Write an enzyme that holds these catalytic residues in place. Sequence first.
Site, PDB file in Angstrom:
ATOM      1  N   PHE A 217      12.616  -4.538  -7.064  1.00 50.74           N
ATOM      2  CA  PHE A 217      14.053  -4.563  -7.430  1.00 50.74           C
ATOM      3  C   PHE A 217      14.870  -4.301  -6.159  1.00 50.74           C
ATOM      4  O   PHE A 217      15.166  -3.123  -5.861  1.00 50.74           O
ATOM      5  CB  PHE A 217      14.333  -3.562  -8.554  1.00 50.74           C
ATOM      6  CG  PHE A 217      13.309  -3.724  -9.651  1.00 50.74           C
ATOM      7  CD1 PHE A 217      13.266  -4.907 -10.388  1.00 50.74           C
ATOM      8  CD2 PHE A 217      12.469  -2.673 -10.023  1.00 50.74           C
ATOM      9  CE1 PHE A 217      12.396  -5.043 -11.476  1.00 50.74           C
ATOM     10  CE2 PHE A 217      11.599  -2.800 -11.108  1.00 50.74           C
ATOM     11  CZ  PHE A 217      11.563  -3.987 -11.837  1.00 50.74           C
ATOM     12  N   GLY A 218      15.138  -5.365  -5.392  1.00 57.17           N
ATOM     13  CA  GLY A 218      16.234  -5.447  -4.405  1.00 57.17           C
ATOM     14  C   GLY A 218      15.838  -5.032  -2.988  1.00 57.17           C
ATOM     15  O   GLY A 218      14.625  -5.056  -2.639  1.00 57.17           O
TER      16      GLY A 218
ATOM     17  N   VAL B  35      15.794  -3.058   0.831  1.00 57.04           N
ATOM     18  CA  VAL B  35      15.678  -1.790   1.584  1.00 57.04           C
ATOM     19  C   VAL B  35      16.411  -2.008   2.898  1.00 57.04           C
ATOM     20  O   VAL B  35      16.076  -2.978   3.582  1.00 57.04           O
ATOM     21  CB  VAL B  35      14.213  -1.378   1.797  1.00 57.04           C
ATOM     22  CG1 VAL B  35      14.122   0.007   2.407  1.00 57.04           C
ATOM     23  CG2 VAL B  35      13.435  -1.446   0.484  1.00 57.04           C
TER      24      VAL B  35
ATOM     25  N   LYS C 182      17.076   2.009  -0.803  1.00 63.89           N
ATOM     26  CA  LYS C 182      16.631   0.944  -1.737  1.00 63.89           C
ATOM     27  C   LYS C 182      17.721   0.756  -2.791  1.00 63.89           C
ATOM     28  O   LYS C 182      18.139   1.772  -3.385  1.00 63.89           O
ATOM     29  CB  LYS C 182      15.310   1.345  -2.396  1.00 63.89           C
ATOM     30  CG  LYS C 182      14.225   1.798  -1.424  1.00 63.89           C
ATOM     31  CD  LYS C 182      13.120   2.588  -2.087  1.00 63.89           C
ATOM     32  CE  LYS C 182      11.850   2.619  -1.269  1.00 63.89           C
ATOM     33  NZ  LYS C 182      10.682   2.957  -2.117  1.00 63.89           N
TER      34      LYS C 182
ATOM     35  N   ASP D 178       0.647  -2.563  -7.419  1.00 62.96           N
ATOM     36  CA  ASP D 178       0.911  -3.437  -6.250  1.00 62.96           C
ATOM     37  C   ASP D 178       0.396  -2.751  -4.995  1.00 62.96           C
ATOM     38  O   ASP D 178       1.130  -2.748  -3.955  1.00 62.96           O
ATOM     39  CB  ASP D 178       2.393  -3.765  -6.123  1.00 62.96           C
ATOM     40  CG  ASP D 178       2.690  -4.853  -5.098  1.00 62.96           C
ATOM     41  OD1 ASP D 178       1.754  -5.553  -4.652  1.00 62.96           O
ATOM     42  OD2 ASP D 178       3.852  -4.970  -4.728  1.00 62.96           O
TER      43      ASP D 178
HETATM   44  C1  LIG Z   1      14.115  -6.170  10.413  1.00 68.24           C
HETATM   45  C2  LIG Z   1      13.790  -4.726  10.805  1.00 68.24           C
HETATM   46  N1  LIG Z   1      12.470  -4.467  10.243  1.00 68.24           N
HETATM   47  C3  LIG Z   1      11.515  -3.846  10.953  1.00 68.24           C
HETATM   48  O1  LIG Z   1      11.671  -3.474  12.112  1.00 68.24           O
HETATM   49  C4  LIG Z   1      10.168  -3.624  10.262  1.00 68.24           C
HETATM   50  C5  LIG Z   1      10.312  -2.599   9.356  1.00 68.24           C
HETATM   51  C6  LIG Z   1      10.566  -2.878   8.019  1.00 68.24           C
HETATM   52  C7  LIG Z   1      10.697  -1.856   7.080  1.00 68.24           C
HETATM   53  C8  LIG Z   1      10.546  -0.520   7.453  1.00 68.24           C
HETATM   54  N2  LIG Z   1      10.656   0.564   6.658  1.00 68.24           N
HETATM   55  C9  LIG Z   1      10.478   0.573   5.313  1.00 68.24           C
HETATM   56  N3  LIG Z   1      10.031  -0.494   4.521  1.00 68.24           N
HETATM   57  C10 LIG Z   1       9.891  -0.340   3.143  1.00 68.24           C
HETATM   58  C11 LIG Z   1       9.457  -1.416   2.382  1.00 68.24           C
HETATM   59  C12 LIG Z   1       8.364  -1.321   1.538  1.00 68.24           C
HETATM   60  F1  LIG Z   1       7.647  -0.171   1.422  1.00 68.24           F
HETATM   61  C13 LIG Z   1       7.982  -2.428   0.803  1.00 68.24           C
HETATM   62  C14 LIG Z   1       8.654  -3.635   0.903  1.00 68.24           C
HETATM   63  C15 LIG Z   1       9.743  -3.742   1.748  1.00 68.24           C
HETATM   64  C16 LIG Z   1      10.147  -2.628   2.474  1.00 68.24           C
HETATM   65  F2  LIG Z   1      11.193  -2.731   3.265  1.00 68.24           F
HETATM   66  N4  LIG Z   1      10.186   0.818   2.574  1.00 68.24           N
HETATM   67  C17 LIG Z   1      10.615   1.838   3.329  1.00 68.24           C
HETATM   68  C18 LIG Z   1      10.764   1.741   4.675  1.00 68.24           C
HETATM   69  C19 LIG Z   1      11.206   2.971   5.058  1.00 68.24           C
HETATM   70  O2  LIG Z   1      11.469   3.342   6.206  1.00 68.24           O
HETATM   71  N5  LIG Z   1      11.320   3.776   4.011  1.00 68.24           N
HETATM   72  C20 LIG Z   1      10.958   3.071   2.940  1.00 68.24           C
HETATM   73  C21 LIG Z   1      10.302  -0.259   8.800  1.00 68.24           C
HETATM   74  C22 LIG Z   1      10.172  -1.275   9.743  1.00 68.24           C
END
Ligand SMILES: CCNC(=O)Cc1ccc(Nc2nc(-c3c(F)cccc3F)nc3c2C(=O)N=C3)cc1
Length: 282
Positions: A19-20, A22, A41, A134
Site C-alpha cells: 500500500f503506497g 516510502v 510509508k 512476502d
Molecule cells: C532512490 C533512492 N533509493 C535508494 O537509495 C535505495 C534505497 C531504497 C529504500 C531504502 N529504505 C527503505 N526501503 C523500504 C522499502 C521496503 F522495505 C520495501 C519496499 C520498498 C521500500 F522502499 N522501507 C524502508 C526503508 C527505510 O529506510 N525504512 C523503511 C533505502 C535505500
Amino acid sequence: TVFHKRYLKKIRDLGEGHFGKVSLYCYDPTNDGTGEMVAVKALKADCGPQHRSGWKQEIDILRTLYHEHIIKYKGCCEDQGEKSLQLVMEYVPLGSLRDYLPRHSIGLAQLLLFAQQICEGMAYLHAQHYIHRDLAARNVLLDNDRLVKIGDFGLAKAVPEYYRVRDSPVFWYAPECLKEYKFYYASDVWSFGVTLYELLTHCDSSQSPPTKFLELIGIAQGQMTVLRLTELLERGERLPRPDKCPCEVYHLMKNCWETEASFRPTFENLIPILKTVHEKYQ
Ligand SMILES: CCNC(=O)Cc1ccc(Nc2nc(-c3c(F)cccc3F)nc3c2C(=O)N=C3)cc1
C-alpha cells in the site's frame, strides 16, 4: 508518538511497498537541519476501500512488533491529503539486500549471519501469531554490514494454523499457497528458502526466481503461469544450487522447500542450525 506534518521535509522517494510509497524525510522542528532522517510509508491517494482496510492492518501490526531484526516503528503522521495516517519508521540508508548485494561483494559467513537474523525476526513474528506472506530479499533491509531488519509488512496477517489468502509474490510461494490459497506458518519458511537462494546469488537479476522459474516454464502460455509452476514444484523441481553455495546450505534450502509443509523446519528449528553454520564459515 505523533509527528507534525509542518516539520516533515521530503528529501527523496525510496520505493513502492504493498500500500503506497516510502519516502525519505528530514523531521526538523528546530529549522537548523540537524533533525532526524525518517522513512515515511503512505497510502496511495486514490486507493479504494480494500487497500485502505489493508493499510489500517499494516499500521496495527507494525505498532505491536518490537524486535532487533524488525524495522523500528517511530510513530504516525496525520495525512490530511489521503484522510489517513502515514507510518513513520527508522531510516536505513543501505536499503534492501536486493539493492545492496549486487553492488557489494559480501562473504558467505556474512550472508549466513543475515539468514540467521532473518530467522530470529520471523520466529518472533510467528510467536506473535503473524504471517509475513512476502518474505523476499526486497523486504530485508540492511541497518549495517552485520545487522538486517525485516522491513515491509504490507501482506502480513494475524493467524487466529493458516489464513485463507484472497499482486501475489507467486515465485516465493509454497505449493499449498498457489493450489489451495491457504498460507501456513510453514509457507513463510518456503519463502525464507527462496530468500536464502536470493542472498547466495547476491540478488543477481539473471539468477532471480522469476527469471529461473520462467526459464523452466516458458512464456508461450502466460495464462497458466501459476498452474505450470504448481506442477513443476509438485514434480519436485527446485531453483538450482547457487554458485559457491555449500552443499549442506543447499540441503537446508531444499528442506525449506519440502512439498509437504509439515516436513519443513520452523524458524525456531533454523536459528541454532544457522548459528552453527555461520560460525563454521566465519
Ligand atoms: C532512490 C533512492 N533509493 C535508494 O537509495 C535505495 C534505497 C531504497 C529504500 C531504502 N529504505 C527503505 N526501503 C523500504 C522499502 C521496503 F522495505 C520495501 C519496499 C520498498 C521500500 F522502499 N522501507 C524502508 C526503508 C527505510 O529506510 N525504512 C523503511 C533505502 C535505500
